[PDB]
Design a protein around this ligand. Structure first.
Ligand code: NI
Ligand code: NI
Ligand code: NI
Ligand code: NI
Ligand code: NI
Ligand code: NI
Ligand code: NI
Ligand code: NI
Ligand code: NI
Ligand code: NI
Ligand code: NI
Ligand code: NI
Lengths: 137, 137, 145, 145
DNA sequence: CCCTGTTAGCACAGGCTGCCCTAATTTTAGTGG
DNA sequence: CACTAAAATTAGGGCAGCCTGTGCTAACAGGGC
């Protein structure tokens, strides 16, 4: 359903920072409609796997490793949204729902093909900036 | 890694019908590169859920329900292939692999849009036909 | 350590009714020594599961189902208490605490058999009446004037 | 359901030593009707708490600490079995089941009273030896050749 | 040997509920001003 | 009302202990070049 739990967690956190709200496990429990214990356990794993940390104040902070992955996903997300509006012609309202699944399967090759095809876009079809276009190459 | 195990088993069984090769479990192990025990388990799970059934000769055959579903995943896989070649301009030797993943996240909404935008396609860029177009709408 | 939280909440509520005190989430807090937030949360599950209802004036009331269980656990508890004292010879100061755990594991089969071997007791050795002997299936009520 | 998971695991492994059957997580899954992943996760927990170790060949081996506790539970189990047969008269088919729950709530105080009241039983009504009475402190090991 | 499969025993990811906590805050009830 | 003590909630956790899906090797079974 999430298609890829880990990435959804990484991207959910990114969203939170973007939204200005403090990233805590409760914020994720709500947004992904999953039990409290599920988020703790999924986050533990991501911690175990050097993707993030739970600070002393229980703040969620991404590691360099994790922030790299998170960016990659948001980048695909927003490239997806673009592709869906400019080219495919999917109605405004459903573009996000669709991209939420696509972000998890697009390769970086297609990403780079989209940059060309879509005319060096720098923003989602909503004003939202596209992260890490530089590292994409 | 398959993204969707079930759907991949379905499309694989479909491919085997298309190619006219005898549909055995050993056949799914080779292509999906899993172990005999692994594919037997998963198959009997799909049997449990009424997607397929093992005959007397151990022939895996799709149910009514299971056939429909497969057609739909093949429809996606190949429309994805069209889009990746005709529009995105992804190199040829990589379009399948990419669409192997995209097939599992595409919405029918996106499918109907592809039909229009791709100018009523009937085949993947590789040649093979695209099924389920009528069922689509 | 409670062994069964739910049965203990019910039995607690029943002790309180026996004793005369109004049954509030806050009494359970003090009896079972648990945090307020915990006691409210546990009570929601029991409300969810149809064991009790929290009334408009915050009173805790047992449902037919809840009351049934309450008695069945009390009955188990004072039977165990009889056994331990009259048969097993455990020192008094431990027999309640023991019964507090045994109450959560004893079946109705054992209970019935206990009634016969203890020569039809009607009270725990502390004197407190054994409830639910009728619904258990081993006695009928016959009034004396 | 099991009343206390850990103790049931310990006791089940101890059971498997008695019958001389190889102590694998798979056995536990079967006997307690639980999924493999459940027992695996729970066994890690008990490893982590010094109750047992998982050998290189996956054999489950009780640590001294886990063993003491397991004997202590097995002892309660069978003491309770004697009590249910000799004294209470619970039907045979229901006795182990009842004991399977009693084993988890009986104090050692009760175990010692039961040794007296049951005239120093050495065996459960099923024929199986009651282990750990020396540790209980009611007897002394003396060897016969 | 090979092909194809089963049976027995694992791995880990990724879901869940029950039941316990502090802290901080808020709400409900009654005394007294 | 005002003010407070008891009562309860909000907010964010903890840990134990359940589950199914989907992946693996080993060991073997039986049919066959
Ligand atoms: Ni911080
Ligand atoms: Ni979006
Ligand atoms: Ni997503
Ligand atoms: Ni056939
Ligand atoms: Ni293809
Ligand atoms: Ni695929
Ligand atoms: Ni009332
Ligand atoms: Ni008592
Ligand atoms: Ni109790
Ligand atoms: Ni060994
Ligand atoms: Ni037994
Ligand atoms: Ni037990």
């Amino acid at each position: 359903e999430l298609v890829d739990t880990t990435e959804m967690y990484l991207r959910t956190i990114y969203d939170l920072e973007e939204e200005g709200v403090t990233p805590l496990r409760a914020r994720i429990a709500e947004r992904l409609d999953q039990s409290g214990p599920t988020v703790s356990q999924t986050v533990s794993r991501m911690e175990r796997d050097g993707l993030l940390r739970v600070a002393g104040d229980r703040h969620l902070e991404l590691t360099e490793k994790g922030r790299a992955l998170a960016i990659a996903v948001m980048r695909k997300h927003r490239l997806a949204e673009r592709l869906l509006v400019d080219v495919i012609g999917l109605p405004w309202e459903e573009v996000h729902a669709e991209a939420c699944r696509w972000e998890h399967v697009m390769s970086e090759d297609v990403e780079r093909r989209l940059v060309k095809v879509l005319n060096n876009p720098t923003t989602s079809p909503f004003g939202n900036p596209i992260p890490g276009l530089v590292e994409l190459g």
